[PDB]
């Protein structure tokens, strides 16, 4: 089946494999070195020796061996997957030394040889780690302050899009600046990007729960979008921090009436309420559909079912959005 020297290299390969199962790195190297000389046109002996050097932490030697194996496999037309494995291991030495940029370079070569699932996942980990390292390196609170300040100069002139651009650079430079998130939120509210005002206000608020302005900016966007029920709740959270606050009190009072005055046509109610996944779930759930039918037909079904919070709050949500009216 094999040339005698190939078979001899194989017997040594197998003995080397057993030596590695037992973590006998050095006996195994002896077996693979014999196997390598017996059958030199075969990457497997070289990559196995590299496996030792990788496990030992001797990454420079294992890299030289992987590179030699790659050159040999190409000369001798060995499977592309074998070449890929040697590259994957090279990327692994860099991964282990935390040189993720190099791990990626070599994993990219590995993928070209074969897009091995293991490489795809390991290189993704290398990217995630390197990307976080890069953001942390990017962060610099003083540059964030300079961009923030230019954003403020623009903002204050009514140039909200430019302010937003500078605020974006400032946040890349300082991610915990709660005030900065709310300044962007303001740009969006003024530009009618009310949805974006909400997302930046929410991060501002979680970072600084007492920043009453984060709440008034969010609530204003909600009120503007006729989401008076949440706008009132957000303005109220602002009132919980400071009951004398003007937007928190005034926006709250406008929402208090407007949330009912806007119902108008049921089409407005359906389009707005069904935008909310919570009521979509209530309506998509057949148990609720059955409960609702009983409720329409019998006010006592309501009297009894609403004593249990699992139903009472599904109903309360449908009432809050205006889908269920009670007379």
């Amino acid at each position: 089946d094999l040339p005698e020297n190939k078979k001899q290299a194989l017997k040594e390969k197998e003995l080397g494999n057993d030596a590695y199962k037992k973590k006998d790195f050095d006996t195994a190297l002896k077996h693979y070195d014999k196997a390598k000389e017996l059958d030199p046109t075969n990457m497997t002996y070289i990559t196995n020796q590299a496996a030792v050097y990788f496990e030992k932490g001797d990454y420079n030697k294992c890299r030289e061996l992987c590179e030699k194996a790659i050159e040999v496999g190409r000369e001798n037309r060995e499977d592309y997957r074998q070449i890929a494995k040697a590259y994957a291991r090279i990327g692994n030495s860099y991964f282990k030394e935390e040189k993720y940029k190099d791990a990626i370079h070599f994993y990219n070569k590995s993928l070209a040889e074969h897009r091995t699932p293991d490489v795809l996942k390991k290189c993704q980990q290398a990217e995630k780690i390197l990307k976080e390292q890069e953001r942390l390196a990017y962060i610099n609170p003083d540059l964030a302050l300079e961009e923030k300040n230019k954003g403020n100069e623009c903002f204050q002139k009514g140039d909200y899009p430019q302010a937003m651009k500078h605020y974006t650079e400032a946040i890349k430079r300082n991610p915990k600046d709660a005030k900065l998130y709310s300044n962007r939120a303001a740009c969006y509210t003024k530009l009618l990007e009310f949805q974006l005002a909400l997302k930046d206000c929410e991060e501002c608020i979680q970072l600084e729960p007492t920043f009453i302005k984060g709440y008034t900016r969010k609530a204003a966007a909600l009120e503007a979008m006729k989401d008076y029920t949440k706008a009132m709740d957000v303005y109220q959270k602002a009132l919980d921090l400071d009951s004398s606050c003007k937007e928190a009190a005034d926006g709250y009072q406008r929402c208090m009436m407007a949330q009912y005055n806007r119902h108008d046509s049921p089409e407005d109610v359906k389009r707005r309420a069904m935008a909310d996944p919570e009521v979509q779930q209530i309506m998509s759930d057949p148990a609720m559909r059955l409960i609702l039918e009983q409720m329409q037909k019998d006010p006592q079904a309501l009297s009894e079912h609403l004593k249990n919070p699992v139903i009472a709050q599904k109903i309360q949500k449908l009432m809050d959005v205006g889908l269920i009216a009670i007379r």
């Binding site: 954003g151 204050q156 005002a197 204003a220 937007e247």
Partner: peptide, 7 residues
Amino acid sequence: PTIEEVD
């Protein structure tokens, strides 16, 4: 209003 101010 708050949305015309910076912090």
